């Protein structure tokens with residue numbers, strides 16, 4: 001075929017059936033946001049600049065949600081799903097980890 | 099801002115003034131300027147003076 005190919009076209013057949021199960025599941029998309037204030041409830045800010053007060057996901061304890069932390073929220077009614085590792089600057093200083 | 103909240107006190111490890119070596123007259127003069135107008139705030143109000151600001 002050699003159109004929309006980027007692999008050895010042998011492990012991508014099996015990968016093709018695996019991606020159908022991930023497309024049906026909503027592990028993604030998760031819109032990436034960041035916390036601004038924990039309210040003993042959270043004050044989330046989206047990147048498209050519009051702020052929301054959200055609840056809590058059934059995936060995670062509230063112990064793991066911290067100040068300023070990057071968090072993924074639902075595509076629809078915004079709810080905190082998964083904590084993420086911080087820092088968006090890493091793209092010059094990540095290049096020098098030897 | 100979220101950076102202000104990270105700046106708040108997370109508790110700085112107990113130094114105690116005994117582990118600042120020497121420097122006696124400096125300690126005195128700081129605690130005169132910062133510490134007292136918080137705790138002993140009634141003795142400045144009766145005296146009439148304003149409280150040192152920094």
Ligand SMILES: Nc1ncnc2c1ncn2[C@@H]1O[C@H](COP(=O)(O)OP(=O)(O)OP(=O)(O)O)[C@@H](O)[C@H]1O
Nearest residue numbers: 111113114115116117118119120121122123124125
């Ligand atoms: N008078 C002192 N008694 C005991 N330890 C001291 C004394 N002065 C300095 N030290 C030791 O030196 C270390 C470094 O001091 P410090 O970082 O305060 O320097 P500085 O005067 O703040 O320098 P800068 O010009 O960068 O502000 C301290 O952690 C402390 O252990």
